[PDB]
A paper describes a structure:
Although integral membrane proteins like GPCRs are challenging to crystallize, a highly successful strategy is to engineer a fusion protein replacing the third intracellular loop (ICL3), located between transmembrane helices 5 (TM5) and 6 (TM6), so that the inserted fusion protein can mediate crystal contacts. We use two model systems for this interrogation, the adenosine A2A receptor (A2AR) and the Smoothened receptor ([name]), both of which have previously been interrogated by X-ray crystallography and cryo-EM. By exploring various fusion strategies, we determine a 3.4 Å resolution structure of antagonist-bound inactive A2AR in detergent micelle and a 3.7 Å structure of unliganded inactive [name] in a lipidic environment.
We designed two different constructs, [name]-PGS1, in which the PGS domain is inserted to [name] after position 441 on ICL3 and before position 445 on TM6, and [name]-[name], in which PGS has inserted one and a half helical turns (five amino acids) up towards in TM6. The reconstruction of [name]-[name] is, surprisingly, different from the AlphaFold prediction but reaches a significantly better resolution of 3.7 Å. This unpredicted hydrophobic interaction with the intracellular side of [name] likely stabilized the orientation of PGS relative to [name]. We surmised that this interaction enabled a rigid attachment of PGS to [name] and facilitated a higher resolution reconstruction of the [name] 7TM domain. Our cryo-EM structure of [name] in saposin nanodisc enabled modeling of the 7TM and linker domain (LD), which connects the extracellular CRD with the 7TM domain. The bulk of the [name] CRD is poorly resolved in our map, except for two small density fragments in the region connecting the 7TM to the CRD, one of which has the appearance of a short helix. Consistent with an apo state, this pocket is empty in our structure without the obvious density of any bound ligand or sterols.
Author numbering: 195 to 441, 1001 to 1207, 450 to 499, 510 to 556
Amino acid sequence: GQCEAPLVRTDNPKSWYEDVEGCGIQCQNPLFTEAEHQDMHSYIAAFGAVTGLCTLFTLATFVADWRNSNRYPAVILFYVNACFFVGSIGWLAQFMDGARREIVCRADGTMRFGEPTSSETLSCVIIFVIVYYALMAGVVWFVVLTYAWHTSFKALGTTYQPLSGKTSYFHLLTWSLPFVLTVAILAVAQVDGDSVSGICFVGYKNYRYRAGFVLAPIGLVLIVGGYFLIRGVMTLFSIKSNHPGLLGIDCSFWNESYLTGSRDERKKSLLSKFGMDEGVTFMFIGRFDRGQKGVDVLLKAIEILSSKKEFQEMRFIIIGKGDPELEGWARSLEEKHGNVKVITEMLSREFVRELYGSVDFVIIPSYFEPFGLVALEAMCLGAIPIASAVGGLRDIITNETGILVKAGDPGELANAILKALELSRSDLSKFRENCKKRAMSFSDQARMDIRLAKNETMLRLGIFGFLAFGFVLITFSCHFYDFFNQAEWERSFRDYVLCQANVTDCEIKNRPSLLVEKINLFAMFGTGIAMSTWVWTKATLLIWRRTWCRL
Ligand SMILES: CC(C)CCC[C@@H](C)[C@H]1CC[C@H]2[C@@H]3CC=C4C[C@@H](O)CC[C@]4(C)[C@H]3CC[C@]12C
């Protein structure tokens, strides 16, 4: 009945150490002393309390006005805060009286490992699933947050709400995936306790399961989250370089005051410069590519259009360079039909701005268009677009704004040009007015989609996307570091424990670093705290101020 510390005597055949019959390992990490146990427990308490309180307040803010705040692209972070709140409560459970022994220790006083098991209680499993599910549920929402930001740039020039029909689709995948992982861990009975952290978690006894079920899934969400974030940056940077100020009023390289004179006066000036007489002007600018922009379609349409008697009533201009055969084809038509201008050089932005604001119609014969930002500048300048019904550009152009055609059909395109002539013989003022109003608006007029309203889902969302990414990257690094060195610490732990009995000095080769543990906790709690600032604005204070006035 004798066992030497750190081992204790028990009658459980499942608690005995490798060959030491009757003796198992006490429920106290032998590689750390009491003083640093109290330090770590105090450290956890501070972050847990702060995360719980601040996260709960944000959740209270959303439900205070759920009828108006329940808007899909702006409530992704609400579920993120919900996930982290549950995780925080899971961590804080250990600070109830006697909780650590009931959670970490077996009834015989030995360390819990290999849970679940029918011979012990459910306290270790309950804490494990709460914390682990909360962790994985949160980071799965994070990749949804970045994806929403990536697609939120489609909410310009249209009324269509992206992902409006996919809200339940995300939810089912978001909650199902962490549930599957949780069940997989329980199926292999790898839930182990640790007095240092104060909770049960994966793979303390075997590093391989901790790498598989924690490190690996966290790595994948970082890859996906980074991918969408990178594309979002390219979109946002591309906007500011080319069309900055595509925002609440209008202020860019375009402005109403930059161009002078009437529409006809500028048209006559440009046509004089090109040696052309008055007519209905159709303009296209773009790269002379194949399969991406229909330059071949546009050029072929002119050949078909050349047979009509109305051909002499219209004026054309093509700007761009690229494949030399398209360039030769365009120049040949220029000489064959002396009513079209061909430009292959680099054209200044100043010239383009005046050209866009003078030409009657702009042609966009694309084969693919991401979401149609290139068509918005022409609409801002009063041009009436004719475009292929491809990509996300179909959501911008409507019957009262322009003409859509099937891609690849030069005959249909020519018919659309003939339709443009029918409109051009009448008053086009309504079409130009609709083009400007639509391009600088969206249908989310809950509070006047202006710079104080729509920047929420373009700029503010972007900040939190990268902010969450940073903390999750730190968490990945901590687990990555431990995984590299866990194998040696296991060997050290084995060697250290054996010499303790002294059955006639022991030394610790190495151990897990408490500093890495603190940083990992900081990043985990930091994400919950960081995402709790979404509602830190003046408007929410007013809501709370009036909410308190229910009294
Ligand atoms: C490597 C990537 C994923 C990191 C995250 C992307 C970073 C670089 C992006 C995402 C969000 C972006 C910011 C979003 C907010 C604004 C406000 C805007 O008025 C000016 C640009 C500015 C300041 C952006 C600068 C670049 C930014 C911080």
